[model samples]
Target: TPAFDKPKVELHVHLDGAIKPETILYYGKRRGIALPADTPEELQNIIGMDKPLTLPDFLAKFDYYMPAIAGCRDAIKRIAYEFVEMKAKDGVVYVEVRYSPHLLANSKVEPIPWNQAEGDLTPDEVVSLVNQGLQEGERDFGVKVRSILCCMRHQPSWSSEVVELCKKYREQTVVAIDLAGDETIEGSSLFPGHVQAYAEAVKSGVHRTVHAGEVGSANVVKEAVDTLKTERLGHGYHTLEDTTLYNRLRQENMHFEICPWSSYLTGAWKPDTEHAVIRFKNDQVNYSLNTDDPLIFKSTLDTDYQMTKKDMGFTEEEFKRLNINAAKSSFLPEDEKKELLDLLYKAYR
Candidate 1:
């Protein structure tokens, strides 16, 4: 029933942005939190977008449901567990889900997020809870799952701590560090907090990826690579504007984490504009298809697959090739990476 009907690898999904609507409704009612809607269907419509909106407008959708989940230890773990279950059903064999731990914590965090009062749930504890839930889900669902901790662009002060958590959990479910959030903030990437965090990530051997060129220009992608030292790009759609840079990245085999539906909904790519991904496909660039935010986009992984396969002329062979490339470029330890590659090869064959 899946668009591809084959094993897939995903690298750009957000944990906070992929929670189940039923779970959100349950938590809202249980905690006496005011939700935009009492029913899951209504809540989904409120959180989901049907037409393209500005990046900031799309991001504001999180405010509707985050209060129902954040700061509650049970809700955090349950969402992590449910995320894996969702991927399993989507036919994803291996996935690396990312999120900002600080957003989910109420303690030991500056200017508590989601307007919640300080509690015992520290950011560190949030990582532990999510790991437990992801591991439990991996066991129950027979899917390989890993996590990436994100440093929000607007909260540079928290970036250093974000790197520390990645260092602490690198051996556990956490696999890499990412820079996420609004990319339109001018001069934000060069902020000292994010710069220091990425530098520490380099020294500590923590894997790195960044949100760049989704809304910003190629200049932002340049800083992310040359300055932040990201190993993978979140959405380098505008990198095409710099022809030399694009060719250099292709020559270096830089991996692009492409989110087709997200690009449309966030207005990162206009409907009339030719998608940069087409160029990537033509050049056989190293890239992977992703569901950046299923809840807000109201899409499954197939929504992306079907779009590219039907509208963009992607083939089943291309799907297999991309999944293989995604596994090769994954942040897994060398041995685990080989195991994942073996699984993909066996399935594809």
Candidate 2:
């Protein structure tokens, strides 16, 4: 058996941010959009050299590549397909890929005149194309894939339209809804309209997840759960800050999708020491490890799990519990959850 051969389930990943930097450069060249720098090393330097970044600064770094991605439905499809292919090769059985559909679209703030001039596909069209790619990947790779449509926090007005689009394609491929992007500045409370839209979507039977407490204070975590009513939280690392809120999460059994590497990379916690996993483990919180942006953060589910085992001192039983927690907390149906858990247990033993 190979080192990579281990059953895994990934509940948190960003599709756009997962594209390998080399691939981004290749796509950029094909699209004739010059990247911020020539070499991958240079690009990494421009994006910041593995340092903890402020949320806005981290987002701003993507401006260089956004133009290249604009209106490139094929690119989006290929990237998504490759992600599934790669994950399957790494023994992932199921993956939930989350990305802001609006951000990937041609925005007024970052207009792509060439795309518009060429009558290229709209953002909604690209989303549909990406879904088709995922469907094709599932057929080829035999891995379950779920697409979670995300609305940027800074663009609350766009949530209803996003929800409408999701409704139109609800039966086709889209499975859930989310609030992501720049949580540091545009905190969860500022997005009342988006939260209301999410509530409406939930009423319509769509699952909800929100990026909360990533860089925000613990109060944001409380607000995300109480105000937004998110079924799952993206980071929730700061949940340690509020004892009352932490107790509420434990009582309710809310899910916290933790990405240790991403958190460390973003300086959400100190690296090499003072990590959040120790705290989470000590508290016996129901959380699962994830690779938020495998490409941007340069990590994967396997790498995160390895780090958790080494740095966080996770035992085999704890690892099994993490898998069980992910299966239970996932957006899948009860029957599907049971099937996944059975498979995971069999694989482990």
Candidate 3:
């Protein structure tokens, strides 16, 4: 086993997005769904992970994962369990995974178990299966884990449903709610009641992490923080455009979920200059490195540190600050959080 240079705390990783391509291919074949690639490397290239990835190009892989899972409760549970095992291997003691159960409903793949035969399952059951699997994984792997339900962009109904789910399951399987999708076409027509769902999440005591500034600019970041009152901004790298907003973010106590390799693939940020990690450091903005979608990008949580710290020359002390930031911002309970912080400081001590 490789002992990492530092203990890990991951706050903004995608559980669905973390499924390895080989895992997906295997699931597809087992579930009788036809996938595009024959091998892992070919799947990487076929999905354009090896090439410069655009917003649309990177998103197209969702279609691949949907069918690969196909609402097989057992299969999804396997994914949830394996994810925690992998994170434990990386020395991550605490994490909060994000995924949208709505996306897996009514899957049109071969079996379509969610909508077919005696195995018909509701979105509730589907999410329950994944949550239970993660619960077992955390206990078994000696890693603490939680999940946030994501509602894709432009789906207010889905957003409301997710808010209800968060309230129903708050302090239990679900800890927070997230709004994620392509920002190029996603917007809040507040006058017509778009973010009212997130507002309800605030009232229900569930946390909010909005996906903004990844596709747009600093204004979107400001909108997410000011208008939506998002507790965290997912990939707000372009906030560098407006010095005032950048400084304002630095002044605030919000977290930025930065995934460098995937951001490079998304063509939104760079490691050399425009990286959120560098900008957040320069401006004293709170942030934690993450892997947005490890499988499609052929990455792990460890690779994020390797790219940002070792390859990119971030100092050891800087990484220490990052690990602590992640620990402080993570959505874990006080008892579990103290355990993670204790682990981190014990190593330094």
Candidate 4:
């Protein structure tokens, strides 16, 4: 057996994307929300569970879960709480859970896709409720869970929406501003508004993380760092494509939150093929292993360790380094990071 039982830190997990399949069914039936697939197995299959995945297919899968949780305060809190509990059981000591609050609210009720329910909570209230859930989970499970409010790139107004919310919550619970939507608009130049908002957020002392180089290119990673001023890069697998940029990124030593499973599932990486995580390792980029979307990708920290061992030929030392890298790249305060590092060493050793 491996030291897969060691403590782990995850900085790239998505709150919405981590909800368990069974929990989706529970929420769907409770909210009387109509889901595309009738049974859990059917829903699982549709969401790319137990199947090969592509980025387009995964994006489409997100829609089915949102309608059920939209404007529902209880559903939001429960998922956050459950996510923490589930992770705590698996030895995840710290997590930075990200989600788009604005998207979760006001889903064009006029079209009436799923009876949004009159008693639903507002967007800000939804965020507040999520904070409550995270706090309660920390208390209940001894796991520290924090939120990174994510804004989409396509919607310029999202900059304002996410930044204002981040300012309001501001380390009380909401920790950072994350730019996470389609990266297809990576260099279109309309990106200024979002980058400006990120600057504003940083100015106000909120942290910044961006999702780029997952659906885009290495140039997108540059834009994320140089322009958006991201404190962290999410899924920067493409950074290896540009040798000059790659060398610069390694020199920079910023954390690239690489979720191996999601990268593989989305065809961003494959075991038999090259995806550059190994190159980044050889190049010694200060990257970390993460579970981007556990339920969605059929991954957890333990499974990620095992998968890396089998696919990347990682040894126990490499596995420990993965945990250490995750801790070093974590969004936690310095004290917490030190404490988490200690916890990992004790558990793994």
Best model per TM-score: 1
| Predictions in order: lDDT | 0.92, 0.76, 0.74, 0.76
For model 4, residues 1-349, the per-residue Cα lDDT tens digits are 4436667778888888888778788778887877877677766666656545655676777777776876776888888889889889778888888987766665432332233545455667768888988889999998878889987776766677688889898666788888887788636324666867888887887888888788688888888888878888988888877888778877777888887777767766655776567766666677777878876776677776666778777677766776688787777778877988888888877
As for candidate 3, its clashing pairs are: none
Strongest candidate by lDDT: 1
Comparing 1 and 4 on TM-score, the stronger one: 1
Cα lDDT tens digits for candidate 3, 26-105: 88888777788778778766654755566556667776666677566677887888889988887787788888776655
The per-residue C-alpha lDDT of model 3 at residue 7 equals: 72
Worst 10 residues of 3 by lDDT: 108-117
* Candidate number with the higher TM-score (1 or 2): 1
Better of 1 and 3 by TM-score: 1
Per-residue alpha-carbon lDDT of candidate 2 for residues 136-220, written as tens digits (9 for 90 to 100): 9989998888788887777777787677667777736676788887677645455677878877887788888888888788887
Model 4 alpha-carbon drift over 4 Å, by segment: 1-3, 50-54, 107-120, 186-190, 270-272
Model 3, residue 113: distance off in Å is: 13
Residue-level lDDT for 242 in candidate 3 = 85
